[model samples]
Target: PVWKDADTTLFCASDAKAYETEVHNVWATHACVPTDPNPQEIHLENVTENFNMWKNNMVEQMHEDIISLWDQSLQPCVKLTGGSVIKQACPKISFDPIPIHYCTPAGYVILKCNDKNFNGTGPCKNVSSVQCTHGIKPVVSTQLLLNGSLAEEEIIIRSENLTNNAKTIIVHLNKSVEINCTRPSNDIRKAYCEINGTKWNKVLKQVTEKLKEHFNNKTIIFQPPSGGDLEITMHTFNCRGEFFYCNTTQLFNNTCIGCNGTITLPCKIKQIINMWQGTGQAMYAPPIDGKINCVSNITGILLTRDGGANNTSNETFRPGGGDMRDNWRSELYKYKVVQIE
Candidate 1:
């Protein structure tokens, strides 16, 4: 018996032949075979020993798994039989999401089909077929624009009005834009959607530059140097307050108490190097063994200065009083000021 009815035990040869031919065509067209490198033909006999099971299984899959139809409206499996037995036996159709990478070119619409449900005692119980096809124009809006004021790298559009399933379409602009979805792997079940927006690179660059500027100069406070005690005698090496004015100057002798020392000369900031360093290391924490390899920006400063001062003293106070203007002969000093954490 090629075709069997759900209620009657009778079999019909003509209906059976039509069912076999339809299954073969369905396997040839849309089928998703898991781990099958190359999908081939599926024979009728290979489908199932009992034809009634195949009919019932196909109807169940259609009503449950397949939510929408892509091709022509589903027709009866056997036209000549004219019965409800093969009404849902044409082919079970479904859609799966295709994930996109960072930057991919074209857009794709995929289709797949399966012969029989994998359950106990069914037609083609041990044999199944799956195949994937691309470039098929599924029902979708040719041009879709992001709806809200938000701009993100990953956006999932899950509108029933758009497509059967939600598609991830990422973009950087709030304007109307269309992006192509790339072809994903055949075995892909769930993956990310990559929308290659032309403005993405420029927007990303600008945002990144702004964040870097804020982090490098605006937010970072000039904390006091760490790792050692500050010993200042003839220099006023301290912050004016906290942020804008950190004073680095040369003060006159006998007046090394505070920044109020008279005749203060400003020391220019020559070069700042390696301001960002990894702080969470074993060396920082002696008991810890492994390399923490952590990093931080506010550590210290390497102040380099070079100047020459004539040794002129006042002969009136204490034999040779220290000069307020000229004292040291010539000097080059490097001050290592680490911020105390």
Candidate 2:
């Protein structure tokens, strides 16, 4: 039995965030004005041999001292404001409106973060959005498998371009039967068909009819799939080639004529045994039924056709039926043609 799946589209939504960076120019407030025009000089009072330490420490003190002296003395002040500087500013966090198209209620909702509002200038480094609703549809494909490997071609089904309800799918079979399928509650990509074991009798009947007509000469049969100790001993008797009476081998002495009247019995036995025990291994050996006796009802019906080349054997379809529940039927499952033969 083979199964297939149809390709369908998907719909999705998301909640997202954005952290944006910004740049700006910054400078001191009094940078444009000059405090003094004359240069002020200061002399070091005490000199020491540790010139490196004196140089580093006295230079900063002298700088403040010079500035104080300049502030005390009168000097010309100049206001020059033609220069510029650049500084990194707080990020202006934002995002392009969550680009989506052909969606129901399709837009993003701006959210608040760190006491900052959406699209408002603040010192926020990160911001998140509330929610979004979207409707999305896309195309998908399937590949056929030959043997156990994949073939070169693929079957692509498009649900995105369809306007009708794509949930319902149609299937065609050699012998058609309507199987109702339903979508699983949590799944949109798959559907399932519920098949009852008792109801499969109708399905088997349809297929068996086709098998009988298509394979006319062969006797088709189905057995339960369960493997167990099932043994069948079949005997074919042809007493017409020679004059054979009841227990003819020892009829004068009154002993049972064994099943050697029509010979190829071993071949039939091997075939059925091999079928039941599997090909390479033997599971259950055919038990010896010693002292066998052939029974032909003298008062019952008899074979009424030409008999020199007639062969009567069954063609068993092994590994038959379905699950274990459908396995144990007690009827012979061949078509009418097998009976007529």
Candidate 3:
């Protein structure tokens, strides 16, 4: 079992309404059985200091100081888990149009926040609604045209209904274009968007299947984007030698066995897969069986084939034999043919 055992102890300043400090320690235990009483730990320390220049400068600064600190320091610490300092400084807020894109012509888009930081005990106010579009480029023209010249002037679509269904927005676009938007699900800072119509869902399936075909029989396996479960298996194929197993909890993401056969890696792969899969690019990589596992972010699978080995005797090499001849030869030959041939 892999668990994080972080013991943090530090002195921090909390009295200065404008300035504050915090200390933290993070320990990640790589591999430990559930029954194991003792396990090795990876220790890390983080220190964060928060200060608002406007607070001390302006006597009128009241809740603004605390809000600034929360946005700059505490919020980031919460996001990073065990970091005391803000990992990503709060981005300066600006009044800009929430860019939106139209891809297809059909349905509702759902938005949900996995995590929320609000206290939930009090009423929050002044929350502004935002709309965004999905596409590589922003949509500049307000009216949806049939061929860039013909304006569908009769298409009277409403953009201000504050609904979750994208169809409502597209009904306003009128042309053969798809549009989507979502209000903040629970958090005021995050939003979601997607194409409303067309065969976007089918398009996603076709793309995933195409990617899997391109990376067939290699050590790594491609995961398609679907709403259902996606599982991956890594067996000891005579042609590819030994490799680790991998699986993903969500569509288009993956988790591979670590060097020591431990599944301690995080789930950031989901985001990586979603990004690459959207572009229709095939991600590939050779398999690794050592204690340290090599995880990929984008489109690709793990390859476990030997580069240029002539023998197939597994008994010839012993674990920790210190003989570079066997292991090095095996790893070098791994994935060579897949990339070359």
The candidate, 1 or 2, that scores higher on TM-score is: 2
Per-residue lDDT for 75-158 in model 2, tens only? 112211233222223121211212111111222221212211111122233322222112111100001000111111221111
Off by more than 4 A, model 1: 1-147, 150-194, 216-341
* Cα error, candidate 1, residue 277 (Å): 40
lDDT of 1 by residue, 101-169 (tens): 011112211111122221112232333211222111111110111111222332211111211112111
lDDT of each structure? 0.20, 0.20, 0.19
Residue 11 alpha-carbon offset, candidate 3, angstroms: 50
Candidate 2 wrongly placed segments (more than 4 Å): 1-194, 197-199, 226-311, 320-341
Off by over 4 Å in 3: 1-181, 185-200, 216-341
Mind giving the per-residue lDDT tens digits that candidate 3 earns over 1-341? 12121111111111111121221000001111112123222221231112111111111121222233223322221132232322344222211111112111112111111112111112222221111111111111111111111113332212122122211111111133222222222223122222322232232234334323333412322233222221112111001111122222222233221112212212111111111001221122222222222211111112122223224321111001111121111111110000001
Model 3, global lDDT: 0.19
Model 3 Cα RMSD, 1 decimal: 27.9
The numbered model that scores best in TM-score is 3
Worst 10 residues of 1 by lDDT: 326-335
